[PDB]
Scaffold this active site. Sequence first.
Site, PDB file in Angstrom:
ATOM      1  N   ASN A 203       0.844  -1.205   0.000  1.00 32.02           N
ATOM      2  CA  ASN A 203       0.000   0.000   0.000  1.00 32.02           C
ATOM      3  C   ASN A 203       0.888   1.267   0.000  1.00 32.02           C
ATOM      4  O   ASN A 203       2.016   1.254   0.474  1.00 32.02           O
ATOM      5  CB  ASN A 203      -1.052  -0.008   1.157  1.00 32.02           C
ATOM      6  CG  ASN A 203      -0.502   0.520   2.494  1.00 32.02           C
ATOM      7  OD1 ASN A 203      -0.307   1.731   2.664  1.00 32.02           O
ATOM      8  ND2 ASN A 203      -0.257  -0.380   3.448  1.00 32.02           N
ATOM      9  N   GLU A 370      -3.768  -6.056   7.706  1.00 35.60           N
ATOM     10  CA  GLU A 370      -2.514  -5.329   8.062  1.00 35.60           C
ATOM     11  C   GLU A 370      -1.858  -4.732   6.798  1.00 35.60           C
ATOM     12  O   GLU A 370      -1.341  -3.587   6.848  1.00 35.60           O
ATOM     13  CB  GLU A 370      -1.551  -6.184   8.854  1.00 35.60           C
ATOM     14  CG  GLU A 370      -0.288  -5.471   9.357  1.00 35.60           C
ATOM     15  CD  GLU A 370       0.852  -5.278   8.357  1.00 35.60           C
ATOM     16  OE1 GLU A 370       0.810  -5.803   7.203  1.00 35.60           O
ATOM     17  OE2 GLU A 370       1.851  -4.601   8.763  1.00 35.60           O
ATOM     18  N   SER A 574      15.696  28.120  25.144  1.00 37.88           N
ATOM     19  CA  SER A 574      16.329  27.366  26.209  1.00 37.88           C
ATOM     20  C   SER A 574      15.769  25.958  26.348  1.00 37.88           C
ATOM     21  O   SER A 574      14.530  25.767  26.371  1.00 37.88           O
ATOM     22  CB  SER A 574      16.139  28.026  27.580  1.00 37.88           C
ATOM     23  OG  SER A 574      16.997  27.356  28.501  1.00 37.88           O
ATOM     24  N   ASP A 612      -0.106  -0.706  39.249  1.00 40.04           N
ATOM     25  CA  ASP A 612      -0.815   0.311  38.489  1.00 40.04           C
ATOM     26  C   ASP A 612       0.113   1.482  38.097  1.00 40.04           C
ATOM     27  O   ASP A 612       0.007   2.035  36.965  1.00 40.04           O
ATOM     28  CB  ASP A 612      -2.063   0.820  39.250  1.00 40.04           C
ATOM     29  CG  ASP A 612      -3.260  -0.125  39.180  1.00 40.04           C
ATOM     30  OD1 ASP A 612      -3.207  -1.187  38.509  1.00 40.04           O
ATOM     31  OD2 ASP A 612      -4.292   0.248  39.807  1.00 40.04           O
ATOM     32  N   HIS A 635       1.832   9.945  21.584  1.00 37.01           N
ATOM     33  CA  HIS A 635       2.983   9.699  22.454  1.00 37.01           C
ATOM     34  C   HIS A 635       3.989  10.843  22.229  1.00 37.01           C
ATOM     35  O   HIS A 635       4.363  11.161  21.088  1.00 37.01           O
ATOM     36  CB  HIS A 635       3.692   8.349  22.108  1.00 37.01           C
ATOM     37  CG  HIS A 635       4.493   7.717  23.232  1.00 37.01           C
ATOM     38  ND1 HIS A 635       5.692   8.236  23.710  1.00 37.01           N
ATOM     39  CD2 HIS A 635       4.282   6.574  23.943  1.00 37.01           C
ATOM     40  CE1 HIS A 635       6.162   7.453  24.669  1.00 37.01           C
ATOM     41  NE2 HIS A 635       5.337   6.440  24.829  1.00 37.01           N
TER      42      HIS A 635
END
Lengths: 696, 696
Positions: A203, A370, A574, A612, A635
Amino acid sequence: KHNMKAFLDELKAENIKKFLYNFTQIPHLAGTEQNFQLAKQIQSQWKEFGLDSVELAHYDVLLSYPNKTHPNYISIINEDGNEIFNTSLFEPPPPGYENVSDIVPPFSAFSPQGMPEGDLVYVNYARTEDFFKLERDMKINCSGKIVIARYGKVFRGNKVKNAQLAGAKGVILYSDPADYFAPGVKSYPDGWNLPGGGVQRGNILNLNGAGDPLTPGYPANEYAYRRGIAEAVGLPSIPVHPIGYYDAQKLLEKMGGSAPPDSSWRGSLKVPYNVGPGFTGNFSTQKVKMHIHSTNEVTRIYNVIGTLRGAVEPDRYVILGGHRDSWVFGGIDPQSGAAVVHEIVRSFGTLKKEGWRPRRTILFASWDAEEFGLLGSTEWAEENSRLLQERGVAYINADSSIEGNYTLRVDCTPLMYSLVHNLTKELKSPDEGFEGKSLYESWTKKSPSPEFSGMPRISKLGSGNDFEVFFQRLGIASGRARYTKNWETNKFSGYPLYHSVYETYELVEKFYDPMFKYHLTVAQVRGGMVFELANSIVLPFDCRDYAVVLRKYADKIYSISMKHPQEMKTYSVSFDSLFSAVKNFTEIASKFSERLQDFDKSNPIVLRMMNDQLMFLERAFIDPLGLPDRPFYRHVIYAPSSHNKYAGESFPGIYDALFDIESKVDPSKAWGEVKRQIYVAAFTVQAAAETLSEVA
Amino acid sequence: KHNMKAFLDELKAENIKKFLYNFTQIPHLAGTEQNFQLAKQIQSQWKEFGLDSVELAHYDVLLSYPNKTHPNYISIINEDGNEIFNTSLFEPPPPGYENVSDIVPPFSAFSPQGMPEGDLVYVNYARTEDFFKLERDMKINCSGKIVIARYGKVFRGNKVKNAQLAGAKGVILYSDPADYFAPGVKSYPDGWNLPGGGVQRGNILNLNGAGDPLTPGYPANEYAYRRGIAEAVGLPSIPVHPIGYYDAQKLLEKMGGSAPPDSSWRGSLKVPYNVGPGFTGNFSTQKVKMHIHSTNEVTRIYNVIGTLRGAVEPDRYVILGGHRDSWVFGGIDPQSGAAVVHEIVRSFGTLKKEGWRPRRTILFASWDAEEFGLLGSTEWAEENSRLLQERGVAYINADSSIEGNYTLRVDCTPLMYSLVHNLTKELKSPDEGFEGKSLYESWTKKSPSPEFSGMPRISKLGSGNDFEVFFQRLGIASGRARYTKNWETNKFSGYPLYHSVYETYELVEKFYDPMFKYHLTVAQVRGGMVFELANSIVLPFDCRDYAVVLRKYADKIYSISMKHPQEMKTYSVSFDSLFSAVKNFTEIASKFSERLQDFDKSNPIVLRMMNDQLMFLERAFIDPLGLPDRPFYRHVIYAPSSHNKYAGESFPGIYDALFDIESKVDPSKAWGEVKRQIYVAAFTVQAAAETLSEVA
Ligand SMILES: *[C@@H]1O[C@H](CO)[C@@H](O[C@@H]2O[C@H](CO)[C@@H](O[C@@H]3O[C@H](CO[C@H]4O[C@H](CO)[C@@H](O)[C@H](O)[C@@H]4O)[C@@H](O)[C@H](O[C@H]4O[C@H](CO)[C@@H](O)[C@H](O)[C@@H]4O)[C@@H]3O)[C@H](O)[C@H]2NC(C)=O)[C@H](O)[C@H]1NC(C)=O
Ligand SMILES: *[C@@H]1O[C@H](CO)[C@@H](O[C@@H]2O[C@H](CO)[C@@H](O[C@@H]3O[C@H](CO[C@H]4O[C@H](CO)[C@@H](O)[C@H](O)[C@@H]4O)[C@@H](O)[C@H](O[C@H]4O[C@H](CO)[C@@H](O)[C@H](O)[C@@H]4O)[C@@H]3O)[C@H](O)[C@H]2NC(C)=O)[C@H](O)[C@H]1NC(C)=O
Ligand SMILES: *[C@@H]1O[C@H](CO)[C@@H](O[C@@H]2O[C@H](CO)[C@@H](O[C@@H]3O[C@H](CO)[C@@H](O)[C@H](O[C@H]4O[C@H](CO)[C@@H](O)[C@H](O)[C@@H]4O)[C@@H]3O)[C@H](O)[C@H]2NC(C)=O)[C@H](O)[C@H]1NC(C)=O
Ligand SMILES: *[C@@H]1O[C@H](CO)[C@@H](O[C@@H]2O[C@H](CO)[C@@H](O[C@@H]3O[C@H](CO)[C@@H](O)[C@H](O[C@H]4O[C@H](CO)[C@@H](O)[C@H](O)[C@@H]4O)[C@@H]3O)[C@H](O)[C@H]2NC(C)=O)[C@H](O)[C@H]1NC(C)=O
Ligand SMILES: O=C(O)CC[C@H](NC(=O)N[C@@H](CCCC(=O)Nc1ccc(F)cc1)C(=O)O)C(=O)O
Ligand SMILES: O=C(O)CC[C@H](NC(=O)N[C@@H](CCCC(=O)Nc1ccc(F)cc1)C(=O)O)C(=O)O
Ligand SMILES: *[C@@H]1O[C@H](CO)[C@@H](O[C@@H]2O[C@H](CO)[C@@H](O)[C@H](O)[C@H]2NC(C)=O)[C@H](O)[C@H]1NC(C)=O
Ligand SMILES: *[C@@H]1O[C@H](CO)[C@@H](O[C@@H]2O[C@H](CO)[C@@H](O)[C@H](O)[C@H]2NC(C)=O)[C@H](O)[C@H]1NC(C)=O
Ligand SMILES: *[C@@H]1O[C@H](CO)[C@@H](O[C@@H]2O[C@H](CO)[C@@H](O)[C@H](O)[C@H]2NC(C)=O)[C@H](O)[C@H]1NC(C)=O
Ligand SMILES: *[C@@H]1O[C@H](CO)[C@@H](O[C@@H]2O[C@H](CO)[C@@H](O)[C@H](O)[C@H]2NC(C)=O)[C@H](O)[C@H]1NC(C)=O
Ligand SMILES: *[C@@H]1O[C@H](CO)[C@@H](O)[C@H](O)[C@H]1NC(C)=O
Ligand SMILES: *[C@@H]1O[C@H](CO)[C@@H](O)[C@H](O)[C@H]1NC(C)=O
Ligand SMILES: *[C@@H]1O[C@H](CO)[C@@H](O)[C@H](O)[C@H]1NC(C)=O
Ligand SMILES: *[C@@H]1O[C@H](CO)[C@@H](O)[C@H](O)[C@H]1NC(C)=O
Ligand SMILES: *[C@@H]1O[C@H](CO)[C@@H](O)[C@H](O)[C@H]1NC(C)=O
Ligand SMILES: *[C@@H]1O[C@H](CO)[C@@H](O)[C@H](O)[C@H]1NC(C)=O
Ligand SMILES: [Ca+2]
Ligand SMILES: [Ca+2]
Ligand SMILES: [Cl-]
Ligand SMILES: [Cl-]
Ligand SMILES: [Cl-]
Ligand SMILES: [Cl-]
Ligand SMILES: [Zn+2]
Ligand SMILES: [Zn+2]
Ligand SMILES: [Zn+2]
Ligand SMILES: [Zn+2]
C-alpha cells in the site's frame, strides 16, 4: 511444576514447521474467501487448544484491488501514440504453483485510476533529501513529470507523498539489484534473491495512525457513518505502480538530461542513472504512459480474538498479536509469525488443561488487513479503547519471525529492556559456534550496543506494523522480536523477496531455517516475554531504563538545535526546562525503585498500587491533543518519522519544528513553535515522573 | 465509634458563622495581595486542623482590571459632542463599608478597550431567539449599532457572542427590576433586593472549557510558552460594560423605532421598551458613546490543596473543592461555600486526631480566579490530569451554600442519585413546619420530581463553576448542592444582589440564614456525600440510574428530530442504533448490579475490579476527539448548552446538529452530520456498557 520452563519446553520446532506449511499453500489476501476460511480454522483450533473463548470480530473497511478484466501496465509510446514497450502483466509463478488461482498481480494498493502521459524524472529513493538535491541544487522541476524511484531506505507511502508535493503527475516504483540482490547468491528458486521479473506489492497510504480511511476515531461497525472518498484519510492524488528490474532497465536505459549528481544515486543496472527530464536526443519525442484501473471497495475483514482468563487479575490484559492476511502465499510475511503464535497458544493451552492459569488475562489476536494499513488491529482497538487504556499491561507483536539467520533483533519500549536482557540470558543460542552458550552472549557479540560495552543493541519502535495503535495512540508498553541478517551488503532494505509471489514455504525451509531452530528461538523470546508479563507478581518493567534514554534523547535534540546558535540567542531558546524534567524523572524513578524492592508483598493493595503505577507509566507519555496535524500520534517521546514511517523519531514534536528551519520565511514564528514544543515535552516528562511519586 | 454520625455531629452552625464573618470583612479579588493573604491563612489553619499536607499551587494567568486613573463610563452625547448624561463611576457603598479601600468598580472582565459611538438597539435578554426575532421577523439589522440587553435567562458571555455575531459594535448590560427586584421586599440595606445604583460584575469570555486564555491544554507554570493576545481563546472583539437600573432608565427612556414585538420583551421600568434603532424624533440626532480602558494582565493566582491520606486505598481520590476569590466582599458568592468547606475540614481533622482515617484519600481545594473563567481549578487539573484520570473517584463542588431559604437544590451525575436519596432520608429538615421530619420529605414536598411521584427534583449539571474541568473534560463523577428559592416571582435569574458590592456578611445574617441552619444542612449534605464516597467499601454509585436517564434523553432527541419527518425519510435518518445501545446498557447494568450485591467481599481483588468498573463508568462517556469545535467538552452525554453556559444539554452533539437545521443552505450535508452524531453517541453508549460486562 507449572513455571516458565514447562511452557518453554512444550514449544516444538516440528509443530511450527507443520503450521507454516498449512498456512502457505494458497493465497490469503484480505477480504477474500480464502482468508475468511483460514480465520475460521484458526478459531476452531484455538478452541481445541484450550482457550476459554475465541470469537471473530468483523469490520467493513476500505480496501483496493486491480480490475481483473482491465490490467494495469506502463508503456513507452512514440510520437504516433504506438505503445512500443509494455511492462509485464504478472510475475512468473514459482515451480509447482503455476496452476494456483487468484494470485493478485503486482499493484500499488489505493492508487487512483488514470492514464497520465509524460517525461520521466529519476529521483533516487524519493526521500526528502533526494527532492531537496533535485530541486534546490540541480534546479530540476518535477511539476507535471512522471517520477521513477527505486524502493528502499524509507516507507513507500512517504515516497509517494514527497512526489505528490513536488508536483509529479504519477509515480513508478522499482526494485534495484543494488538493494534487493545479495552478491554471490542465486535467484529464486535456486537461492533467496529477487529475479528480474519479481515485483514488490504494497500500500501507498499516508494514514498517520487513522486506520480505515473512511471512519477515523470510531470502529467501522454495521451502523458506522462514513466519509465520502473525497474526504477519506491518506489516499494519494496521482497514479502509482510497481515494477521489476527487467522492466525498469527498459524505462531507464534511454534517460537523458542531467547526469546523476554523485555515485549514491547509481544502482547496479547497466544504465547511466541520468536524472532527466526525458529521454536522450534520438528518443526525445517518445513518452511514458501509465494505465491504472484499480478500484477502492468497502469490504468485510475478520480478526480472531482468543482469551485465557487470569486467575488473580482477570481485569489486566497482556496481548500477543500478529496478522494473518498476506499479499500472496505469505511464506515469511506474515505466516512465519502466525505459525509461531499458533504453537504459543497450543503450549499455554496444554498447561491450562492440567489446571494452570496465568495470573493476568492473556489475549491472543490474528489480525486482518494489516497489508492495507494496519486496519484490523486499529479498528478493534478503536472499538475497545476504553478497556485497553484502563486495563492494558502490554502488547507483544508477532509478524515475520525471520528476515535473515544471523542474530536476534528486538525493538521495544525502554520499560522492557531489563526483561529482554534477563530472559535472553536463560535461553540457549541456536547459532553455529555458540552451542552451550546463552542467546544473550551470541546476540551481544554479533550486535553490540553502540552505547554500552557488554550489552546488545535494542532499537526504538518505528511503525509499519500492528503495534502502532497500541503504542503511539493508546500508550500501552509494546515490543517486537525476530531473527535478522547482518546489516552488510543490502543495508537499506528488507529481505529480497519481500511482498513478492516468491515468498513461499520452500523459501523458508530450503534457504532461511531448515531445522526451524531460529523459529523456535523466536517463539521462546515472544512466548517468554508474554509468560513473564502475565505471571510475575510485580510487573517486569524498570522505570530507571526510561530515565537513561530520556537523557540521551534530550542531549540529541539539544545538539540539533545548537547548529543554530545565533537564532537560539535572538529568540531566547532554552532547553533548561527539559533537562530539569529529565533530572526529576531520574530522581523520582530511583526512589520508586527502592520502594518497589522493599514494600514487598504481604500487602496486595500496595502491590497493585505500584503495579498500576508501573502499567500507567507508558500511558503518562500520551498527550490527548496529539502531535501537530497528526491527532492519532499522541505519544510525546516516540512517533514514526515524518519522512519514513518505518523509523522511530525521539521528541518528534521538537524534531519536526527544527527540521529545515533555516528555509522558513518567518523565523520568529518558526522558533516560537520550537519553544512551544520544548514546553510540551518538558511538561509531559515531569507529569510522567509525578505518577511515580508517592500517591498521597 | 468513628462513623458518619460522629462526623456529622461535630459540624456546628456557630463555627460556620464565625468563619463567614472572618472571610468577608475586606475584598478578595483574584490576583490581589488581600487574596494571597487569605490563601496563607487557610493553608495555616488547615494544617492546625490536622491535614497531612497543605500546599499552595500557583499559576500565572490572564486577568483583567479597570484603569484606576482612567474610569470606564457610558454617555449620551448631542450633535455638538457634549456629554449630556454620564453613567455612575461606582456603586454607593453599603453602611459601614464606605471607607473600605480597593472595591473594584463595576466592569465587564476581558472587555477590549474602545470608544465606540452609535445608535442603540434593545435586544431583550440577547438570547439566540431574541436575535432571531429581531433579524428574521422584525427585519432590524444590528450591524454597526450599540446593543443594550437585560441580564437574566442565560450566561452573559453567550449574550456577548450573539451580539458580536449580529455585527454590533458594543454591548451594554443592565439589571431590570423585573428580574432582580422581588415584589414586596425592600432594597439593601433594609431587605435583600437590588437598589437602583447596584451593578452586577462578571466576566464575558467564551472559553468552552479552555482555562487560561493563553495556555489551552497545559498548565500556566513558570516555563509555559504563551499565545499572543490575538490568538488567545475566548476574548470578545467589541467593548462591553454593565450598569444599574437608574442609569438604564436614562438610556432607554428616549428609544424610538419599532415597538416591542410582545409583552415578554417588556421589563418593569417606566419606559416603552422600544427596540430602536436610535432615539425618537426630537432626540434622533443624539448618540450613545462608550468609554472602556480596562487592561488584560498576566497575574499570579494561588490554589490551596489539602490532603488527608487514605488508610486502605491512598491512590483513590475524593475531591471537595470550591473557590475563594470574590468580586468584592463575597458574602454569598463564594464565602458562604468556603466557610462550609472550612468547617468540614475541621470536623474530618478532629476524627483524624483521635486516630481515624478514611478508606480513600480526600483532597480539599480552595480555588483561585473562578470569577475570571474557572482558571485556578482548570490549570491545576491540566497539571495533574494523568493522576486525576486514573485515580479520581468523584468531585463535589462547594461554591455558594445559599441562593434562597426555601428548599434543597442538587445537580449531579445520575451515578449519585441513590447516594443523595439515601443520605437526605437520614438528615433532619431545617424547614419551618417539618420539625422532626427528614430533609428528604421536605425537599420532595417542596420540589417534586417532574417524572416520579414521591421523589425530588435532581437537575443535570450545566457549567459556570469549578466542576467543569472534572466532569465535562476529564469524566470524573461530579455533583453540587445548596439551599435555593421557590422559583416563583424572579424565575430567570439568581439572587438579586449577585456580584454586587451589597453581598455582605450582613445580607446573610439578617435576611437569608440568621440561625445558620440552612448552612449547617448544606454542610451535612456536602460533607456526608464526601464521607460516603471516601469510606464505603463498595463505591456508592448505581449504574442502573444512568440507564433510566439515557432512555429519557434518547426519547427527547428523537422527538426533536421528528419535527422533520420528510427529511428523516429522504436522508434515511434512523435512531435505531442509539435505542439499541441504550437497551444493551440497561441489560448489562442490571447484570452488573446482581454481581455487585453477591460477589461480596471476602475477595478484595474482585471488589476493586468492580470498584474500578464503577469509577471508570463516568470516564467511559469521554470522547478523546471532543465535540465539534469544542475540544475541551469531551463528555458525549452532557455539555454546557451552546446558547447558555449555565444550562446542561443532553446528547449535545446531536442537539447542535439539529438546531435551526431548516435554515441551512445544504440540507444533505446538515442531515449527514446529524447521522454522524447519532453514530458517535450510539457507539459511546455501547462502549460504556461494555466496561460493565465481565472483564474476561
Ligand atoms: C523539577 O523539580 C523541582 C522540585 O525539586 C521543581 O522546582 C520548582 O521549580 C519552580 C520553577 O519552575 C519553582 O517555582 C518558583 O516558586 C517560587 C515559590 O516557591 C515557594 O512557594 C511555593 C508556593 O506557591 C511552594 O510550593 C514552594 O515549595 C516554595 O516554597 C516562586 O516565588 C518563584 O517565582 C518567582 O521567581 C521567578 C523566577 O525568577 C519569577 O519568574 C517570578 O516572577 C517570581 O518572582 C517560582 O515560581 C518552585 O518553587 C520549585 N519547587 C521546589 C523547589 O520545590 C522544578 O520545577 C521541576 N522541573 C519541572 C520541569 O517541572
Ligand atoms: C446491542 O447488543 C447486541 C448483542 O446482543 C448487538 O447485536 C449485534 O448486532 C450486530 C448488528 O449491529 C450483528 O451484526 C451482524 O453480525 C452477523 C454475523 O454475526 C455472527 O457471527 C459473528 C462473527 O463475525 C459473531 O460475533 C456473532 O455472534 C454471530 O454469530 C453478520 O453476518 C451481519 O452482517 C450481514 O447482515 C447485515 C444486516 O443486513 C448486512 O449489512 C451485511 O452486509 C451482512 O449480510 C451483521 O454484521 C451481530 O451479530 C449482533 N451480535 C450478537 C447478536 O451477538 C448490537 O449490535 C448492540 N448494539 C450496538 C449499538 O452495539
Ligand atoms: C533482571 O535480573 C536482575 C538480577 O537478578 C534483577 O535485579 C535484582 O532484583 C532482585 C529482586 O528485587 C534484587 O534483590 C533485592 O536486593 C535488595 C538490596 O540488595 C534488597 O533490599 C531486596 O530484599 C527485599 O526483597 C526480597 C524479595 O525480592 C525479600 O526476600 C527481602 O525480605 C526484602 O523485602 C532484594 O533481595 C537484586 O538486588 C536485583 N539485582 C540487581 C539490580 O543487580 C532485575 O530485577 C530483573 N529485571 C526484571 C525482572 O525486570
Ligand atoms: C440506598 O439504600 C438502599 C436501601 O437500603 C440500598 O439498596 C439495598 O442495598 C442492600 C445491600 O446491597 C440490598 O441487600 C441485598 O439484598 C439481596 C436480595 O434481597 C441479597 O442478595 C444481598 O445479600 C448479599 O449481600 C449481603 C451484604 O450486603 C450479605 O449479608 C449476604 O450474605 C449476600 O452476600 C443483600 O442483602 C437491598 O436489597 C437493597 N435494597 C433495595 C434495592 O431496595 C442502596 O444500595 C443504597 N444506595 C447506595 C448505597 O448507593
Ligand atoms: O501500512 C502500513 O503502515 C504498513 C503495511 C506493511 N507492513 C510491512 O510490510 N511491514 C514489514 C516491513 C518489512 C520490510 C522492511 O523492513 N523494509 C525496510 C527495511 C529497511 C529500510 F531502510 C527500509 C525498508 C515488517 O514490519 O516486517 C507495509 O510496509 O507495506
Ligand atoms: O466563567 C465562568 O464559567 C463562570 C464564572 C462565574 N460563575 C458564577 O458566578 N456562578 C454562579 C452563578 C450564580 C447566579 C445564577 O445562577 N444565575 C442564573 C440563574 C438563572 C438563570 F436563568 C440565569 C442565571 C454559581 O454557579 O453559583 C460567572 O457566572 O460569572
Ligand atoms: C490445514 O490444517 C487443517 C486442520 O487439520 C485442515 O483443516 C481440516 O481439514 C480436514 C480434512 O478436510 C477437515 O475434516 C477438518 O474439519 C478441517 N479442520 C478445521 C478447518 O479446523 C486444512 O485442510 C489444512 N490445510 C491445508 C492446506 O493442508
Ligand atoms: C502494448 O499493449 C497494447 C495494448 O494491448 C498494444 O496496443 C494495442 O494493439 C492492438 C493490436 O495491434 C490494437 O488493436 C490496439 O488498438 C492497441 N491498443 C492501444 C491502447 O494502443 C501494443 O501492441 C503492445 N505493445 C507491445 C510492444 O507489445
Ligand atoms: C480571621 O481569623 C484569623 C485566624 O484567627 C486571623 O488571623 C490571625 O490574626 C492574629 C491576630 O493578628 C495573628 O496573631 C495570627 O497569626 C493570625 N493567624 C493566621 C493568619 O493564621 C485574622 O486576623 C482574622 N481576620 C479578620 C478580618 O478578622
Ligand atoms: C460627563 O463626563 C465628561 C468627562 O469628564 C464631562 O465632559 C468634560 O467636561 C470638562 C469640564 O467642562 C471639559 O473640560 C472636558 O473637555 C469634557 N470632556 C469630554 C470628554 O467631553 C461632562 O461634563 C460630563 N457630563 C455631565 C452631564 O456630567
Ligand atoms: C473493469 O473493467 C471493465 C472493462 O475493461 C469494466 O467493464 C468494469 O466496469 C471494470 N470493473 C470495475 C470498475 O469494477
Ligand atoms: C515548475 O513548473 C510549473 C508548471 O510549468 C510551474 O507552474 C511552477 O511554478 C514551476 N516551478 C519552478 C520553476 O520553480
Ligand atoms: C543462512 O546462514 C548462512 C551462514 O552464514 C548464510 O551464509 C546464508 O546465506 C543464510 N541464509 C540467509 C537467507 O541469509
Ligand atoms: C491608565 O490611564 C492613564 C491615563 O489617564 C495612563 O497614563 C496609563 O497608561 C493607563 N494604565 C494602563 C494602560 O495600565
Ligand atoms: C446590515 O448592515 C451592514 C452595514 O451597513 C451591511 O453591510 C449588511 O449587509 C446588512 N445586512 C442586511 C441588510 O441584512
Ligand atoms: C427567608 O424565608 C422566609 C419565609 O418564607 C421568606 O419570606 C424570606 O423572604 C426568606 N428570605 C429570602 C432571602 O428569601
Ligand atoms: Ca475506524
Ligand atoms: Ca492552561
Ligand atoms: Cl514483528
Ligand atoms: Cl524493503
Ligand atoms: Cl456549588
Ligand atoms: Cl443572574
Ligand atoms: Zn506483515
Ligand atoms: Zn507485509
Ligand atoms: Zn462563585
Ligand atoms: Zn460568582
